[PDB]
From a paper:
The predominant form of IgM is an asymmetrical pentamer, with five IgM monomers joined together by the joining chain (J-chain). In this work, we present the cryo-electron microscopy (cryo-EM) structures of VAR2CSA, TM284VAR1, DBLMSP, and DBLMSP2 complexed with human IgM core. In all these structures, Fcμ–J exhibits a pentameric architecture, with the J-chain conferring asymmetry on the central Fcμ platform, as seen in the complex with the secretory component (SC), i.e., the ectodomain of the polymeric immunoglobulin receptor (pIgR). The pIgR/SC-binding face of Fcμ–J is also targeted by the P. falciparum proteins, and the interactions between the P. falciparum proteins and Fcμ–J exclusively involve the Fcμ-Cμ4 domains, which is consistent with previous analyses.
We also determined the cryo-EM structure of the DBLMSP2DBL–Fcμ–J complex. When compared to the DBLMSPDBL–Fcμ–J structure, an overall similar pattern of interaction between DBLMSP2DBL and Fcμ–J is observed. Similar to DBLMSPDBL, DBLMSP2DBL also targets Fcμ1A, Fcμ1B, and Fcμ2B; and all three of its subdomains are involved in binding to these Fcμ molecules. Distinct molecular interactions are nevertheless present at the DBLMSP2DBL–Fcμ interface when compared to that of DBLMSPDBL–Fcμ. For example, several DBLMSP2 residues, including Arg214 from SD1, as well as Pro280, Thr281, and Lys283 from SD2, form extensive ionic, van der Waals, and hydrogen bond interactions with three consecutive Glu in Cμ4Fcμ1B (Glu525–Glu527). Arg221 and Lys224 contact Glu525–Glu526 in Cμ4Fcμ2B. These interactions are unique to the DBLMSP2DBL–Fcμ–J complex, and likely contribute to the higher binding affinity between DBLMSP2DBL and Fcμ–J. DBLMSPDBL and DBLMSP2DBL bind to Fcμ1–Fcμ2 using all three subdomains; however, despite this overall similar binding pattern, each protein employs a distinct set of residues to bind these Fcμ molecules.
Numbering used by the authors:
A (entry chain J): 3 to 69, 98 to 136
B (entry chain L): 345 to 444, 449 to 575
C (entry chain K): 468 to 569
D (entry chain A): 523 to 574
E (entry chain H): 523 to 568
Amino acid sequence: ERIVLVDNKCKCARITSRIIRSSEDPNEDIVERNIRIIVPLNNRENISDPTSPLRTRFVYHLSDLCKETCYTYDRNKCYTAVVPLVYGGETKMVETALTPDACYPD
Amino acid sequence: IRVFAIPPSFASIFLTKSTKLTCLVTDLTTYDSVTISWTRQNGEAVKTHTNISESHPNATFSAVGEASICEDDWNSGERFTCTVTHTDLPSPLKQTISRPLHRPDVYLLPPAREQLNLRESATITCLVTGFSPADVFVQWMQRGQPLSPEKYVTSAPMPEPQAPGRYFAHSILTVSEEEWNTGETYTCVVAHEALPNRVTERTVDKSTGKPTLYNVSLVMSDTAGTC
Amino acid sequence: ESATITCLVTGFSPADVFVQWMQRGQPLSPEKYVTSAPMPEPQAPGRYFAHSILTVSEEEWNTGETYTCVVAHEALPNRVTERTVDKSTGKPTLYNVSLVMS
Amino acid sequence: VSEEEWNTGETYTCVVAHEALPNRVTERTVDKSTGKPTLYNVSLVMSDTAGT
Amino acid sequence: VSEEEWNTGETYTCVVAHEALPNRVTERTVDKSTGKPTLYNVSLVM
Ligand SMILES: *[C@@H]1O[C@H](CO)[C@@H](O[C@@H]2O[C@H](CO)[C@@H](O)[C@H](O)[C@H]2NC(C)=O)[C@H](O)[C@H]1NC(C)=O
Ligand SMILES: *[C@@H]1O[C@H](CO)[C@@H](O)[C@H](O)[C@H]1NC(C)=O
Ligand SMILES: *[C@@H]1O[C@H](CO)[C@@H](O)[C@H](O)[C@H]1NC(C)=O
Ligand SMILES: *[C@@H]1O[C@H](CO)[C@@H](O)[C@H](O)[C@H]1NC(C)=O
Ligand SMILES: *[C@@H]1O[C@H](CO)[C@@H](O)[C@H](O)[C@H]1NC(C)=O
């Protein structure tokens, strides 16, 4: 029986807990808080704006996410950044999708 | 014929969502069909006594001016004069009661391990500090199930040592050890003013207690944006 | 801002308890620690419960002082009884920390 | 591109337009530290492990 | 005490009485976990 305390989707923290049960006796059960953080290793300060360089710092405040920028992309919401595309002398300002198969129109 | 005015507790308007006025009169002489005047600044009369004991073996006939009024009227700070009209007193005396702001600092503390080692029972406390109004009520609730009033007891208001204006109170729902260690949910709620919302729900469990083990699972994978 | 320490004690049949707090064996002023009056217990009317609440700075808590709660009662064989809290007074807190690089 | 441009590399983007894209435009970004990096310089800090 | 009794983790409180003590007597407690610093083991799995 694993209970999920909090879960920040775009940070991918997944703070969970479970009470392991030993033989019946005066209480010696080990309470544990189990987290599973997926570091990107390739994302930027903005995951949407390509101009920002690679981010080395990886900040994970547990209390801040239990209750802004983050590292992991989401599969539900869209990340759209404005991008310039030029054909000839003039230019047209167009949208783009940073990641594929995430929130394509249906 | 004693003269004294007692204000109803602010916990009454949260427990029953109503206000019940009461005048503190002790050992008034038993007389048939007594009348009591409880006048506010408007001077309106008070509704008659309800559920009173006309005959008392100890002759303690308390004169209670029971009535139902809105909380706005009492919160306005109006002067409340208890005119104790009686045959014995030709000129009744007047007694006045009135009330002249920080959010409650409420946190729930897990029980000690020594109590669990003793196996007799378990005691959990709910610390309510940092509140300027004198009165405060704490209710204990397990998954929406009300309890007996005598199982949990609240403490009298005492001045905070750091700040004389602030007050502190401790509330306990003492329980058995088995109900604690099987993971049954315990919630603490406070009914106090000077708060953004009406009540704040606070809970603690064995799982959400002191954790001994920590297996963080940080996967350094080039794949990103999938979870 | 600060750390609040409460002292849980129950079971007063004589119903007469005094609680004292000291640091490194040096008794503290009565202003800092306050003792609540005894009150009846739901399980047994004979047994009472009392509390002491100490208001100390959090930086002093992080130093790891003794913070003993001396409870004095007639029924105690030595007429006093104190317990010591510390930064690691509870479980040994073994860590299962892991780092995956798959 | 020149080699000194790749040194302290700037963000080079590949923007392509086609019918089958969801938003009709996609973008891929590479630099020195992303495309086949020599080293993975990361700083990983955790604070307040006790939580609330 | 026996080794198994020490394994059971009993209180084993030592109490000492003297006139110079503030309460004339003081107590201390020793267990198996009276020390036991936090155990950190790290895993590196790929
Ligand atoms: C990097 O992050 C900043 C965070 O503030 C972003 O700047 C703004 O982000 C909001 C979020 O959608 C946009 O609505 C604004 O238009 C952004 N500002 C500008 C000037 O574009 C943005 O993602 C990045 N910063 C910049 C300067 O591009
Ligand atoms: C931590 O260990 C327990 C086994 O006691 C396991 O069930 C749990 O999944 C582990 N946590 C993570 C994040 O894998
Ligand atoms: C870390 O310590 C715990 C405590 O005994 C142990 O169960 C766990 O297996 C240890 N981790 C590893 C990787 O050995
Ligand atoms: C965490 O500790 C438990 C002991 O209860 C052990 O079985 C488990 O393998 C540990 N987790 C690891 C080594 O990832
Ligand atoms: C690598 O990371 C460390 C710590 O974040 C930093 O001090 C150093 O400048 C970085 N070096 C490069 C080449 O990015």
